[PDB]
C-alpha cells in the first residue's frame, strides 16, 4: 500500500487533468446548448416579423 498512495500523488495531477477535461467538456456543453436556443429564438423572432410585415404590407395593399 505504500506504493499504492506513494503513486496517487505521483498521478494526482493527472486526476486534476482529467477532471478539468470533463469539467469543460459539459461546460462547452452547455455552451452550445444555449447557442443552439438562442439561434432558435432569432429564427422565431424572424418569423413573427416576418409575418408582421406581409400582413403590413398586406394593409397597404
Known amino acids: ?6 503513486a496517487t500523488a505521483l498521478l494526482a495531477s493527472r486526476g486534476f487533468a482529467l477532471y478539468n477535461a ?3 467538456k459539459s461546460i462547452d456543453f ?3 446548448i444555449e447557442e443552439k436556443s438562442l439561434a432558435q429564438l432569432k429564427r422565431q423572432m424572424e418569423r413573427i416579423r416576418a409575418k ?3 400582413h403590413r ?4 395593399d
Not at 1 to 6: C, F, G, K, S, T
Not at 57 to 60: A, H, I, S, T, Y
Request: charged fraction near 35%; charge should be positive; hydrophobic fraction near 30%.
Open 1 to 6: 500500500v505504500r506504493a499504492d498512495l506513494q
Open 57 to 60: 404590407q398586406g394593409r397597404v
Open 30 to 32: 452547455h455552451r452550445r
Open 22 to 24: 470533463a469539467n469543460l
Open 52 to 54: 408582421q410585415e406581409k
